Every structure is written in C-alpha cells, then in structure tokens.
Nucleic acid binder design. Structure first.
Lengths: 65, 88, 65, 116, 100, 49
RNA sequence: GCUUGAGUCUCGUAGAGGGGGGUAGAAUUCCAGGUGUAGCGGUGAAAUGCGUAGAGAUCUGGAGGAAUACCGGUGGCGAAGGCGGCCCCCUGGACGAAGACUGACGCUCAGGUGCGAAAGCGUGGGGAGCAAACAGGAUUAGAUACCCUGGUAGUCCACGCCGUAAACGAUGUCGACUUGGAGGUUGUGCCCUUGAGGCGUGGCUUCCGGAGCUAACGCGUUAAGUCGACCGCCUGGGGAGUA
C-alpha cells in the first residue's frame, strides 16, 4: 500500500535516491515484493531503476568489498 | 518494419483515399513494401530462424489477396505489379 | 554484512548478519548447479506456499465439535 | 610485536575444518590454530568444542603484540561463530566490530559436485 | 529527434576543466540539431562503490534530444575521454526536467 | 488510517503526517487585511519565513 | 452481389523469443611476492595422493574458458524444441479501444520441404570446474559399480551430416455451442481513476465440480462433453519396432 507505483505516475527514476535508499537494504540487496507491497511489474520497473543505479554508481551492488 | 511515414503515402498513392485501405492494391503493396524494406534484416546477421515464420506470414498473405485480384480484375493485377513491381 | 555496536554487547551477536543474507550465498555456491532444480523447486515450492492461504479459508467453515 | 592493537580474526569454517586466525589489520597472519591441529582428527574436526579450543590456541600470545579492540571478519559460516567468537570475547577482548564479509558475486563459475 | 538521458561522471581531477567541455558537448548538439532539456552540474558527489581507483566522482547531467547517430559518436567520445569513466543513455519517447 | 500507512514509513517523512487547520475571518467583518507581523523558531530556524 | 468467417491499415503494450558483437562485477585452477602452521581432502570407517623442494588458508595484482544471484511469479514467448544480467542494430509473433474495406480471398494434407534439445564425426580455436576409456585404496567371497584423488572425447562458437526422444497436461489442428468461483499474468472502455475499486470484453494456464462420457481413477469452457472438415495409426504378447 504505497503511493509510489500506483499513484506515483510515470516510471520512478533512480536519480532521486532519497526514496531508493528505502528499497535497497542498507547493503545493496533488494527488498522482496512480498515485503514492500508493490505490483510485481513495477518491482521489476524499480528493478530497472536499481539496475541502472548499479551501472551509474548511485546504488551499488553491495555495501563494501 | 514498414514505417508509418511510408504506409500512409502508399495508401495515398495506390489507394484513392487517405483511409480506404481495405482494398486489394493497398494491402499488397503495403506488405510488399514491408519486404522491400525488410532487406536490411534478412541480409545482415542472417541467423533469424524465428523471424523466418514472420516472413512466412506476410509474404503468403500477400499472395492471397493477389490470389483474389486475379479472379476479379486481371487489368489491375498486371497494372499493380506494373507500377510498384511485386511479381519480381 | 557488518555489525558494530560500540560496547553494550559482551556477545558475538550475529543478528544483522542473519538479517542481511549471510547463508543465502553459501546455499547456492557449495554444490553443483544442476540445470534442472530451478524449474523444479521454484514451482513446487511456491505452489505449496499458496496452499497455506487456501487452508486459511477452508478450515473455518464447519468444524462444529 | 608490530605495535598493533587492532587485529583481524579471519575465521574460515567450512566442513571438518575451523581455522581461527588473528592477523594484522591488513591480513598478516600473526598466528592461527586449526581444530584439526589441536587434535580431534575425524568427526571431532566438525565439533564446535574443538572450535573453542581453537579460539584459545589462537587467543594466546596475541596480547604480546597488544591487541584488545579487534575485528572478527568471518569468511567461513561454520558450526561455531558463537562457540568461538564469544570465546575471544571471553578471552578478555572487546571486539570493536564483528564482521561477516561474505564475497558476493552474481553467481559465476561452477564448484565441485558433492554429497549424494 | 531522439530522447537520450545522458548521465555521466568524470574525474574529480577534471572537476574544473569539464564545465568548459559542457560548452563543448551541448554546443555540438547545437551544431547537430538538438535541444537540451536539463543542463545540470551538481558537483563531485560521493560515488557508491570505488570505481577501480578513486571514490567520489564528478556527476554532470544533460538529458538531451539529439539524433541516435550523434549520441553514438557522443558516447564514443565519452568512453574515449580520460575524464568520463562511466556514461550511459536511456530510451526515447520520455523526458524529464526534475531529476531531483 | 489502515489503508494509508506504510507510505509514511518508507517513502519519506512529512509527506502525509501533516494536515490543514487554518484560521479564517470572523463572520461579521468586511474589510482589508492591513498589517502583518510574524516571528520564527528561536534556536532552530523555521522555513523561508 | 451482401456480411456475423480469415486478414490488412491507423494508434499502443509486457517479456528467459532469436541472431551478430561488445561490456560490468566477482570467483574456482594456476603463477609470483609479504606472514605462518604441521597438517589437508574425505568418508558409515579407512585410504591412495599432497606436504619441511614450506601445501590447505589469508591479502593484492594478472592471463584464459565458461556460467548469470536476491527481484522469480504449475508466470512469459513458441508450431515444436527450447530458452533467464544489461546494452546496441534489426525484426516477428500474441492481444486490445473506436472505425474504414476486399467480400469466404478459409482449413488440412501421403510423396516432399523446413525446424529439430542432446550427442558423435570432419575442420579451425580450445581447456578453469567436471567427466566416458584407464590406474589406485577398499565395503566384499571378486570389482572393470555407489565414494575419493587425477585425467582424454566432450561440455562452448561457427559451417554441414544422422533427421533421433518421456520431441508427454502422454490427449493432433481449425471453427461453433454448453450453469461458476478462488487465483496468477498482460491491455482497455464506462462511473466522483476523489485512493491500491465496481460492472463487461480476449489469449494462456492450475485446482475443486454440473450436464456428459468412462472399466475406474478422473477430464470438465485450455475437456477424455456435443457436431462437421482434414491427417496418421491398430487388430493378443513375445519374435521386433530387429535383419
């Protein structure tokens, strides 16, 4: 039940990470779609946001090495 | 892929209206224009076996409305292949 | 991944470790891949997970003893 | 020696092997002990009690260096990690930070086939 | 013609000689028929994970409407620039102006 | 409320918890607001005001 | 000649569909350098082997070859087979709101053509993990089997050949008709989408059941139900799906 991918219209970009640091666990993992209740489609769309965040170094692959 | 910028022009030339696209000389030239532009796809990389059934589809259907124009107006049939050139 | 907590512990406490992933890497890297298991267990597994919910709705009807 | 207070106890516990290893803050093994080097050859190599003796066999001659506040980075999720981490915390140390640094790749090559 | 959300990071070393290249890149889009949607220079924001050598890179955003054959030459230049270490683009149709 | 929670538990902070309970002109007045003097949060400054 | 059949066009949608190339992170084997121990692997138990010519382990760096985590959903694409990171070039199939048209232009099919996982072979590269042939220690009355330490064809990529399967919800393909629900996945029209709702309309798929069928289990709008069209096949098993 969130106003992210239901009322928050038009794909959520990874530029504003003041919200994406809520979707990743403080390490680098992703929070399951059964935890933060969002429709599987947009959890893959947020999976596209987090993926490109891992490609442009905003949201890493993991915390440290 | 048959660009829309070209489709509306073929229907503009061959078809007698902007939207009277359900006629013989339209659907044929349209699908023929698909092939004519599809050259770039089945020339390079070559190994598109799944895209082969897509070809199968549109080429055969084309030969189906020609399959009908033949039984109706042989004057326009030889004329259609004469303007655009879709026999060869 | 990494837990600190300055000095109110007097214990190892692997809480955040097991809260992040910890074993989730070991379970997949110890033995051979076996190209078949994914198909198998993704399906079988979640099917049975759905049954618990189905159990919730079908166990409250009668039971009049 | 080495003039260090911050040590790094790398613990690799796979199956029948549990190795406690206090190293320098870099990873310079200043001393270690195996549960299989402390005897217990066999099924006991897979027993946390041997693991706690290992924690001790590796907790000695380390304050000769000067380590008190130490890091315990484990790269071996075995049967201990209580029996031994709480053992160093029982030896008299204060583990500033208890770490679990599991290397995490997106699944790559293939490991051996086993147990079947 | 086509929308490409070009986001790139250069070296904190080029943190001062890149705004001059900001003039270069977008002026080239002007010399290649194209409008920019949001010209931004935030600063040398701290990276997520260290990229081979140094942490904290200099981020700069463009998000520009230019031909694909032009951004193709452009990403080539980015990839072949000692400043830019990473530079990727998105797909067409959609565009932004907030980015915050 | 049940159907609104979790948003203000993940998304942000002040994006919902706050509402609007303004003040209005008492019935019986028909004039023009003239002077306005306001003051802000000592020690930990308010917004742009 | 006309349309409720097929199909095309206008405007859009999601993805392990495919082909060619490239990129990212990290890792097993091996090599070298700093430290250091006398043990390591493994099994029900034991052991060949390795090691003091300093292994296993730990930190950093590096060349090859191959594989895609959490997100993952009896979910998705397809004739079938089969197939999961991403991007770039190109393209197809499935489906839908509201309309304009050709006017049955449709379905299937022996010989035939094409697709055909995996594997074997001819050729140019190839070798980390593993593994036919083979060697060794043993449970044992024996071991050319289960275990373990090595290792060649192979596993990978491209061009051809054999044209083979549990190539199986075991149920051929196409159309029409016959009370529903919990679901999953992907669009849209209408109403105050004020909000993650309500009422209809299609594809795929699972389970519980009605009419019906069957030896029975059970299938059941994706039917093993009711009809029509087209195709292959059977007449007890073995012999043999073999010469």
């Amino acid at each position: 039940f969130c106003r992210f991918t239901a009322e928050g219209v038009q794909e959520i970009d990874y530029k504003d990470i003041a919200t994406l640091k809520n979707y990743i666990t403080e390490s680098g993992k992703i929070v399951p779609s059964r935890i933060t209740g969002t429709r599987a489609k947009y959890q893959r769309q947020l999976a596209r946001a987090i993926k490109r965040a891992r490609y442009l170094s905003l949201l890493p692959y993991t915390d440290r090495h | 892929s048959l660009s829309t910028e070209a489709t509306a022009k073929i229907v503009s030339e061959f078809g007698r209206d902007a939207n009277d696209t359900g006629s013989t000389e339209v659907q044929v030239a349209l699908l023929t224009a698909q092939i004519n532009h599809l050259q770039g796809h089945f020339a390079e990389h070559k190994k598109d076996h799944h895209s082969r059934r897509g070809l199968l589809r549109m080429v055969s259907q084309r030969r189906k409305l020609l399959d009908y124009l033949k039984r109706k107006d042989v004057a326009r049939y030889t004329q259609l292949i004469e303007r655009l050139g879709l026999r060869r | 991944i990494k837990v600190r907590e300055n000095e109110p512990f007097d214990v190892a406490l692997r809480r955040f470790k097991r809260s992040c992933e910890k074993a989730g890497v070991l379970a997949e890297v110890r033995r051979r891949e076996f190209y078949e298991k994914p198909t198998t267990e993704r399906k079988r597994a979640k099917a049975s997970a759905v049954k618990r919910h189905a159990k919730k709705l079908a166990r409250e009807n009668a039971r009049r003893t | 020696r080495k003039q260090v207070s911050d040590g790094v106890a790398h613990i690799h516990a796979s199956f029948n092997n549990t190795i406690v290893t206090i190293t320098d803050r870099q990873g310079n093994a200043l001393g270690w002990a195996t549960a299989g080097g402390s005897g217990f050859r066999g099924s006991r190599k897979s027993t946390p009690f041997a693991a706690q003796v290992a924690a001790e066999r590796c907790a000695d001659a380390v304050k000769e260096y000067g380590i008190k506040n130490l890091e315990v980075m484990v790269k071996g999720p075995g049967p201990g990690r209580e029996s031994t981490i709480r053992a160093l915390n029982a030896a008299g140390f204060r583990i500033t930070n208890i770490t679990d640094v599991t290397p995490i790749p997106h699944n790559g090559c293939r490991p051996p086939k086993k147990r079947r | 013609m086509r929308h490409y959300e070009i986001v790139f990071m250069v070296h904190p070393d080029q943190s001062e000689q890149v705004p001059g290249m900001i003039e270069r890149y977008t002026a080239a889009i002007t010399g290649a028929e194209g409008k920019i949607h949001r010209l931004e220079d935030w600063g040398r924001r701290q990276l997520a994970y260290p990229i081979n050598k140094l942490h904290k890179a200099h981020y700069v955003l463009m998000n520009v409407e230019a031909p694909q054959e032009v951004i193709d030459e452009l990403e080539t230049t980015f990839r072949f620039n000692d400043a830019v270490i990473r530079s990727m683009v998105m797909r067409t149709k959609h565009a932004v102006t907030e980015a915050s | 409320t049940p159907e609104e929670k979790l948003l203000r538990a993940i998304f942000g902070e002040k994006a919902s918890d706050v509402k609007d309970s303004s003040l209005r002109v008492p019935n019986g007045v028909s004039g023009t607001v003239i002077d306005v003097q306001v003051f802000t949060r000592d020690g930990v400054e308010k917004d742009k005001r």
